[PDB]
Symmetry: C3
Subunit: 364 residues, 3 copies
């Protein structure tokens, strides 16, 4: 099952008592069945309360989404700064080469961020450039020679090397006094920022797309947001009670990357007398699962479930269901055609299709 | 000759007394000389009078063109239906993930369709998802487990399997009564739909680009059509009497994919003391020939010829001729430069270039 | 150092007493670290005064820049001609499949053209199609058969072969009389064509971006020019006095291709737990690639002049790590600076403020 990505598929970049930064292996590492995802990578960050991820930039375009907790994300530009107070469901597009740092200002909640990255110099391959100098990594400033550094900073190398080069890793503890000072002018999201070119936006800013007693699905697309339109990506989040089933359906043109935030679930995927291929998998918290465009899929929540999804090639994507009383494509095919396509009669076919009176999310 | 594609290069996907679905091999299969066409595939469909292509969707963007006959192409959306009555020269873009079926409503004419496909999940590799259940293929619904299907459809698996799972292939016969019932409300093209975002358009909707006693060429480009602009593709159709010659010319930036509909022709292609490379081939009905951008080419009709062409990387493409009285690039080169580029004198060069008083199509 | 391209990396296509056409090898030939430049190729042209580059077209989109001298670039369309008088710093985008010829109208100056090419049929691979017939190459017209050519031109093959098929190479001498007649209606650039859809534009048409006693940098981006916008490319030219240093900085998202026009320089680049230190000494005509986000510094060993093609340019930012202007480090709060660097907040500020100059400083 090349579409299932569990912990063995992630790679740790930085880890200590305060935080864990890791990246998913290249989507096309194992199988070449996901070739059109070669330009993308998934980054995962988790940190304890009152912590700071040191300043750095990446040679990759970034789309950040907060799964759990609160974060003060501060973009450090060459002539100014932009800080944002981001909470669960907030997303922010950070251009490649933008220096930034992240603070978890909460006193009790851990922070969990997921980042969709799009490398610039090589397809799906990139590096993180930390300005800081720790035991886990040397500052990129150390790449320059002594004579160069002396001329640039116009000071003796013994001083530069003492002040700059001379912490355990890239995630460090920060005082409540410093957190309070670093959170002063942080801007947050609002229903107005839904269509902003630079400000953060929440995935639950509007009414959910699907919503009943068993589940809810919220979504932000390239249609309302300029940031997402340029990346041609949609973002969605789903909540399902234990025992609920996300009815059979397929995405018309979007390649969907699933990230399990909370809970467990069984997922069935269908690929292609010509036989169909049955891909099966049991998903756990933090697992990743890829749904190729056009492939029918089903998600069954084993416990209270919450997952997020990044939709690549998103523009005008359509969700077509094969069961249920709403958005059921089969119920749109005329009886004359249904009768020729299936063995049963036009009557048996319609009676069957009407059996399930609920839609989207049903009892498993 | 890596640019010539005869019948041995097509792959049969489905075939019986009523129809034949075939797909051309990957363009860069044999030679890596067509590397920039690896994202595209050509699909061919031919069916007898009064038949139906069963409902399915593809994980690939589709641009459909009718070469012969009539078709009732019905797009089945999750909330509704859209059916079109298409005749020769009509084209329609069908987005990936769109379920549809095709009917040949005519009583005597065979339908012939050509589709330019653009796979979503893998470069130039895709699959067809048929909802139907026949001897040639199982429904993709059979990919889900019994328990899942029971909960989804709220019915015992014995009923589902009986009505939905339980025809010889994907092409079947259809009564005239049913054809009549499925042909109601079908919308057709007209001079106005040339610039429609979703309606079909005819390649001969307007005056031909080139036209004389020996030939005609019609063309629709991204400049007037939004569907074509989004794909950055142009469509053209050519008619040439037996013994006519399509004068030497090259496409400035478009990579042109030719498909012979009727007739036969000899084609010469020129690639690159540095010597030129001569590519020769004799074309027959249904053959395909690729003309890389910038490569001089000539088409000589051995018999009454009719062919269609899909032009990739089409925006602002230009046809530059090297002979004839119209659009001859050589006649635009100042005599001072002509004399320095060619061994002959300025007078000898001007006299030679002027001998051919006809343009575009001349006697072979 | 896979980022350095010296004379050994170029390929001669045509050469004689009057001119020299060469093309840089595929960027991803030696290494795979430059995979996202695989669709690009750099073409170089140098010619003597009073010379003509014979008419031809290429199956590649072109972005032409004049580094030295003057040129009459004439685009020959199927229905007419477009002529342009190009001088130093002038640029013009020429669509794939456009026939054209180049004249060096000057009586004393050598012409130097650099061309960024984007091949159409194959990533980074293409060919030049010359109409001319010389000892170095046959006309692409010879690719057709006698019977086709006879029907096409409506003339016996003996005449066609005599008049067209039958000069040593594709660069030839041309009289001053012919040059004056061939320059009759050439349009030139001006501050008014900086953002032109079809006309040539000059890199120094407006005030430089950075400018002090030691150096200068001019730049034209997709934001102002439509031709550059469609290619998502920016063009810049730099002038540095001997002993000057282009302060440490990095391009946020643009992959920059450097071309040395005059002078020499030492360049330091840093990649990525230890950092990788790429070093190189640059000479005239050398090429050097600077990946996006990679800190870099340029030290002029002698009076220096170089041009740069910036790929993936839209909204590119230049972030410096030293100096009194556009310094990213000076924008990092002291609470954070103090946590990322071992020195104290006071020691970090004093250090960052020591350099009162910006962009270009004393090496
Ligand atoms: Mg504390
Ligand atoms: Mg019948
Ligand atoms: Mg002379």
């Amino acid at each position: 099952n090349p579409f299932h990505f569990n912990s063995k598929r992630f790679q740790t970049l930085f880890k200590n008592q305060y935080g864990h930064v890791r990246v998913l292996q290249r989507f096309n590492k194992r199988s070449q069945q996901l070739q059109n995802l070669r330009d993308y990578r998934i980054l995962e960050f988790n940190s304890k309360p009152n912590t700071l991820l040191l300043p750095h930039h990446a040679d990759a375009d970034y789309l950040i989404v907060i799964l759990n907790g609160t974060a003060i994300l501060t973009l450090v530009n060459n002539d100014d700064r932009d800080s944002y107070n981001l909470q669960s469901g907030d997303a922010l597009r950070v251009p490649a080469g933008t220096t930034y740092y992240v603070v978890n200002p909460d006193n009790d909640e851990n922070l969990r961020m997921i980042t969709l990255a799009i490398p610039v110099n090589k397809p799906g391959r990139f590096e993180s450039f930390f300005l800081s100098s720790t035991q886990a990594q040397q500052s990129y400033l150390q790449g320059f020679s002594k004579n160069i550094l002396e001329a640039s900073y116009d000071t003796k190398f013994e001083e530069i090397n003492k002040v700059l080069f001379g912490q355990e890793s890239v995630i460090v503890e920060i005082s409540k006094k410093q957190i309070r000072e670093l959170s002063k002018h942080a801007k947050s999201s609002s229903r107005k920022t839904i269509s902003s070119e630079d400000k953060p936006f929440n995935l639950r800013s509007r009414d959910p797309i699907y919503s009943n007693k068993l589940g809810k699905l919220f979504e932000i697309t390239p249609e309302k947001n300029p940031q997402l339109r340029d990346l041609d990506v949609f973002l969605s989040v789903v909540d399902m009670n234990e025992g609920a089933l996300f009815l059979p359906h397929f995405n018309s043109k979007a390649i969907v990357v699933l990230v399990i935030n909370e809970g467990e679930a069984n997922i069935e995927l269908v690929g292609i007398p010509l036989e169909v291929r049955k891909y099966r998998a049991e998903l756990s918290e933090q697992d990743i699962f890829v749904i190729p465009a056009g492939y029918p899929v089903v998600v069954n929540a084993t416990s209270d479930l919450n997952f997020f999804a990044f939709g690549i090639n998103a523009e005008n994507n359509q969700r077509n269901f094969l069961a249920g009383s709403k958005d059921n494509v089969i119920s749109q095919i005329p009886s004359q055609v249904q009768e020729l396509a299936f063995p049963g009669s036009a009557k048996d076919i319609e009676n069957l299709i009407k059996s399930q009176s609920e839609s989207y999310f049903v009892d498993a």
